[PDB]
Design a protein around this ligand. Sequence first.
Ligand SMILES: [Mg+2]
Ligand SMILES: [Mg+2]
Ligand SMILES: [Mg+2]
Ligand SMILES: [Mg+2]
Ligand SMILES: [Mg+2]
Ligand SMILES: [Mg+2]
Ligand SMILES: [Mg+2]
Ligand SMILES: [Mg+2]
Ligand SMILES: [Mg+2]
Ligand SMILES: [Zn+2]
Lengths: 122, 85, 136, 97, 95, 23, 107, 116, 45
Amino acid sequence: PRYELALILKAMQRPETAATLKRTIEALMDRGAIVRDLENLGERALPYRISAHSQQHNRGGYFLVDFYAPTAAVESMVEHLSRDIDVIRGNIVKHPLTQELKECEGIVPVPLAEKLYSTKKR
Amino acid sequence: AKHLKFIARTVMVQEGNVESAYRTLNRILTMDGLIEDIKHRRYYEKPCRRRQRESYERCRRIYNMEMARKINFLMRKNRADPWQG
Amino acid sequence: KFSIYPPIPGEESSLRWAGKKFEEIPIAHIKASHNNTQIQVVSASNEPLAFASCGTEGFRNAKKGTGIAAQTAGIAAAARAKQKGVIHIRVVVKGLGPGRLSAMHGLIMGGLEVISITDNTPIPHNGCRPRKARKL
Amino acid sequence: VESFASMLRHSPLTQMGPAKDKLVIGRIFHIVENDLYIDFGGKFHCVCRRPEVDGEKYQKGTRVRLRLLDLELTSRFLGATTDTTVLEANAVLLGIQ
Amino acid sequence: NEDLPISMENPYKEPLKKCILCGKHVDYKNVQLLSQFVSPFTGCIYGRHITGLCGKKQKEITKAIKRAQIMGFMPVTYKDPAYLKDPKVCNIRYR
Amino acid sequence: KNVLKIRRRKMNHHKYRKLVKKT
Amino acid sequence: DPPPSTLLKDYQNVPGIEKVDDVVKRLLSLEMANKKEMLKIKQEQFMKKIVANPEDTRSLEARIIALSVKIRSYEEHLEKHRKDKAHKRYLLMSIDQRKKMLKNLRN
Amino acid sequence: ATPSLRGRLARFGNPRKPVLKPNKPLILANRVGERRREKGEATCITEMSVMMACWKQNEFRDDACRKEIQGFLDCAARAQEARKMRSIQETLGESGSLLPNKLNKLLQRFPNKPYL
Amino acid sequence: REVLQLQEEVKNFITRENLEARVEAALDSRKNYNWAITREGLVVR
RNA sequence: AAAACUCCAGUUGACACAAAAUAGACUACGAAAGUGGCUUUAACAUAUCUGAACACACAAUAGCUAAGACCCAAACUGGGAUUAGAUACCCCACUAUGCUUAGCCCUAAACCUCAACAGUUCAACAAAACUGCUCGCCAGAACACUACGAGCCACAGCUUAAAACUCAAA
Ligand SMILES: [Mg+2]
Ligand SMILES: [Mg+2]
Ligand SMILES: [Mg+2]
Ligand SMILES: [Mg+2]
Ligand SMILES: [Mg+2]
Ligand SMILES: [Mg+2]
Ligand SMILES: [Mg+2]
Ligand SMILES: [Mg+2]
Ligand SMILES: [Mg+2]
Ligand SMILES: [Zn+2]
C-alpha cells in the first residue's frame, strides 16, 4: 500500500540536504520502494525544541514523501533514519485519501430519550 | 520547559489593571478546566471514585441544563395575571 | 483595539516599556503552595536580582501560607528591585496558594509595574502518581 | 353540502403552511397595562410587549401585522411523559396594518 | 374522496444541516485548521459544544492534532502565534 | 441494603484465618 | 503459498495486465498489499481446484475452505505471537465450527 | 446542546454496559435549589498592613499614622455599609437571577409530571 | 478505467536518473497544506 | 504543632524501562476480565438457535518463583503528634510491591447482582408487564467461602461440599 514519510531534518545548506535526500531515496529503492513524488513543505522554525541524537535544534526543514513499499521496508527505514543523524525525525504513516470518505447526509436530530422510568405517582 | 516562554497561560496588563487581568486569567483557566484538574491532582484520585465523580457530574450537568432550559422557556409566562376572576 | 495577547520575538511589537522591548524586561517568579510562597526576581539573562520569602521575613509555620506574608515578601522584593534599579516586571506564577494573588498587590505597593502575568503552573498528563488521599 | 375534508383542503391554514417565518395580521382582545394579547389566527393568541415607539397607539380592534415562530410553545423534558405547554404562541411584530 | 389526505413524505423537511467540515477533508498537516480547533492560551482542545461539528470530524481532527503534536508540526502548550489573526469559529464567552 | 449476613461471613472468615495462623 | 509477484484478485479480467509496465505489475502484486489479499487469492485457488460451481460462497465447502485459510492465518499469527490469547480463542472457536460443519457435511 | 442518554443507563434492552449510574432516579423535580453563601467576609487587610508597616517604622506614632489609620477605619465602615447594602439587595431581589421562591411558585403553578 | 490513472502516473514516478533533477526542483519549489474555514464553511487561505 | 532536610531551596540548560491532561457533554471495541499518548505490522469466529461443574482457552487487582529497572506512590517498619490508653485516623523517611522479561497461583460487591435465542404491548422498592423454547441454579436461620473425602505446579491456599447440637424464627 501507499506510505507517506514525514521527514524533519536540521537547517543546513542545499548540497548536503540534497545528499541526504538522495541517499534516503536510495535506501527506499534498496528496500524495494517505489516513490510516487516528493513534496517540499519548506524550512520553518520548529514549534518546540527537540534534542536530536547529539544536538538540540530549534529550526528545521519539513519534507514529505509518498511511495509504495512492503511491510518490512517500514521497520527497516525506521531504523535507518533513526541511525541517521542529519534527520531530526522521520515518521511513516498511511495515506488519508486512500480511506474513501463515507458519504455524509448531515447530522440527525437526537430526540430526547423516554420511558427510562415507569408511570408511577410516587 | 523546552517550549517557548510567555505565550501560553499569559495575559497582558493594560492601564495597570492587575485585578481584571487576573480575573480574566482565572476565568479562562476555569473555562478550560485547569484549576479543577490541579486541585484534584493534588491528591491521587482512584479510578472507581473518579468514575463515580464523573458520572455524578454528567447527571448534574444534564439536570441543570434541562432546568435552565425550562426556566428560560417559562420566564415569559411569569407576568401580571390578566384574568383575575 | 488593545491586544490581550503578548508580543512575539518576530515582529512587530508596537509596545515598549521605559524605552525597552518586552523580552529584556526582568521576570518575577512566584512559587505558591499551601504552607509557603517563595518569590524571586531575575534579569532577562538569568541573572538573579533579588530573592526573599516569608521565612526570611520571619513568619512561622502556621502563617507562612497567608496573603499578608506574601504582601510583605512582595514589598521587600520590590524594595530590593527599586534599589537595584528595576521598575517594570513580567510576572510568572507557579502553583496555587493563598498569597498567590497577594504577591502581585505586594509588589505594586512596593512600587513595581507588572506588565504581564504568566501562569506556568505544573500540569502532568498523568505523568506521576501523587500521594494518597487524606481522611480528615 | 361540502365535506370537512374539502373545507380543510380549502382552509386558510392548509394554504398557510408552516407558521414560522410568515407574516400575519391580527387584533387584540385583552390588554394589560404593560403587554397586549393578539388574537391573530388558529387556536392560541400570542402575548407581546408594547413597543417603545408609538406606545399609546394600541387599543381594542387595532389591526397589527407581525410574524410568528409557532402557534403553540411546547417542550418535552427528561421526565415529561407529555410535553410541557405554554398555552400561548411566540411572535414578533414590526408594523401595524 | 379526492380532497382526502394521502400517505406522503414531508417536503417541509429542512435538509439535515452539515458542519463546516462535514464534507471537507482534514489532515495532520493543516496546522492552520488544527490550531483553529484548539484553545490559544492553554492549548486545550475545544470540545464538541464549543466547536459545533459532528463527532466523526471531531475525532478525526483531534487524532490529527495529537499526531501533529508528537510529530513536530504543532506544539502542545501554546498555540502558534501566527495563526491567531484568523476566523474564530469556536464560540466562547470570556471576551 | 443490609449487610449483616455479609458481616457474619466476614467475621467467620477472619476467625478462620486466625485459627489457621495458629494451627 | 502463492508467489509474491502474482497480481491481485480484482485485476484478472482486465486484459491490460500484459501491456502495462513492469513496475505497475510489481505494485499490483499482492505481496505489496496486506495478507488478506493473499488469503482471498488462496481461497479462490482452492475453490477453483475443488468446487464444481465457483462464485458460490453460500456453499458449505466454500465456508469450510474460508475457515481453513483463516485458521492457517491465525496459526501463523500465533506462531509469531505465542501470547495472543484473543487470536488463540478465535482459532479454537474456528476449528470447532469447522469440525461442526465437516460433521454436518459428512451427514 | 444537551447530551443524549440513549444507552447511558442500565436498561433491559440496553445490551452493552451502562455509562451513567445516578444514585436517585433522574426525573425533573418541581422545586429549584435555594441559594447559598459564598465565603466568610474579609476586608481592610491591606489597610491594616499599611498600618502595621507605619507602626513598626514610627514606634506607634498615631499623629503620623493618621493617614493610613483613617483609611483603615473608612474602609471598615465602607465594608459594613456594603454588607448592609447587599443584604437589602438580596431582600428586595437579586438582579438578573430570579428568586428561588418565585421560581418554585411558577414551577408549582405549572409543574412537570413523570406519571401519566 | 482505474488502471489508466496510475498507468500514466508512472511517468511522474521518479527513478534514479530523474532523482538528481526532481530533488533539486522540489527543494527549490515550495508548497503548503494549510488552510482555514469560516463559520458558514467557506475555505480561506 | 512536632519531627525531617539544610549535599537545602528558586530561575535557567541536558536527561526515563515510570503513567499517558484537554478531546471525552464522545458511547466505540472485546465473549468476559478489560481497553481511551503517537506510528507500523498481524487481526477482530460461526449467514438456523440452545448447549460441558466429565473438557479446553481465558480470567481484574492482589500474591509466588529468578533476573533486571528507580521518577513517584506505598502495605510493613521506624520516628514525630493526639489520646487515660492509639499496635489507627494526621505528618516525615523507607521496604516488599506496583514496571519489562519466562513461568505459577485462578480468586473479587468478577454486579448492570436482571441467563442465551425469537418476539408482544402491577405485592413493595428497583430498571414497566409479558409470551414460546433451551441450559444452569435454589428449597427455614446458623453451624458453613466450615469438617471429611477427591483434584490442582497451588502446601497458611483454591474448587466441590456436608453432618451433629440449638432456635422459632431468620
Ligand atoms: Mg441508588
Ligand atoms: Mg476526559
Ligand atoms: Mg506481579
Ligand atoms: Mg522492591
Ligand atoms: Mg468489574
Ligand atoms: Mg452473578
Ligand atoms: Mg448460557
Ligand atoms: Mg474466598
Ligand atoms: Mg476451604
Ligand atoms: Zn459532518
